Amino acid sequence: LVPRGSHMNTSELRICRINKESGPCTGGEELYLLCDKVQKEDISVVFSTASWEGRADFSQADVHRQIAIVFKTPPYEDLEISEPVTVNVFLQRLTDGVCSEPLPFTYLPR
Amino acid sequence: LVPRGSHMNTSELRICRINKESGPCTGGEELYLLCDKVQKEDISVVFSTASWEGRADFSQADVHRQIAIVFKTPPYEDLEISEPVTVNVFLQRLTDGVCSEPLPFTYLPR
């Protein structure tokens, strides 16, 4: 437990990433972050600067145990597309080839 | 197990979201997705269209068990900022007030 300003930091609590790295100063924006183990009934998200502090709003129901898969995308068939093209992205199990419902993803021209 | 083209889909496999909804048709882009339970040794990510298919590249080491927190951002102190301002975002446990290392987030003007 190392000191950090007016509070203590621990290696036990860790944020891996935030889906977006920026947003409107107006707030009320819905984002999501990935983190190591936390207790949904005893956690919070804080935004701060040396002299300012604001808390994010969420409920226990917004804390989900999920699996995150980091991956590199395959290139699209045609690298010369002049317009955006949105394909399907889905999971597929190797053993029985069963898949998941797809989610859209759009390839952008060069 | 419902038919879907040349394969079968299941409610057992589910993608919740992809961090980015678009990217260069050139591929080789590093993205990450959230999904329900999968077996790291028996899963894959596919991008496709009716007549095209490409697989994403990742290893078992890229499949992580994580906790995802959905939340709404607090507004920034000053809604009149003319330039970008990047603050700190971190987790904080309510019981003992212990925090996590911060991650940057930048508020953008209106």
- For residue B69, which of A80, A29, A66, A2 has the smallest C-alpha distance? A66
Give the method of determination: X-ray
Name residues whose C-beta falls within 8 Å of residue B38's C-beta, 6 or more positions apart in sequence.
Answer: A67, A69, A91, A93, B13, B63
Distance between CA atoms of residues A19 and A6, nearest Å: 28
Residue B28, Ramachandran bin (φ over 0: left; ψ between -120 and 50: alpha; else beta): left
Parent domain of B110: 1-110
Cα radius of gyration rounded to whole Å, chain B = 20
CATH number at residue A107: 2.60.40.10
Distance between CA atoms of residues B21 and A103, nearest Å: 9
Distance between CA atoms of residues A74 and A66, nearest Å: 24
Partner residue opposite B42 with nearest CB, options A71, A72, A94: A94
B60 shares contact with chain A (CB less than 8 Å): no
Number of domains in chain B: 1
Tell me the nearest-neighbour CA distance from A102 into chain B, angstroms.
8
State how beta strands B103-108 and A22-24 pair. Answer: parallel
Best mutation target among A99, A101, A103, A108 (most B Cβ atoms within 10 Å) is A99
Written as six digits, the tokens of B91 are 């987790």
Beta-bridged to residue A63, according to DSSP, are B69
Put simply, the answer to whether B35 touches A67 (Cβ < 8 Å) is yes
The label of the residue with tokens 């309510």 reads B94
Distance between CA atoms of residues B4 and B26, nearest Å: 27
B82, burial (CB in 10 Å: exposed 0-12, middle 13-18, buried 19+): exposed
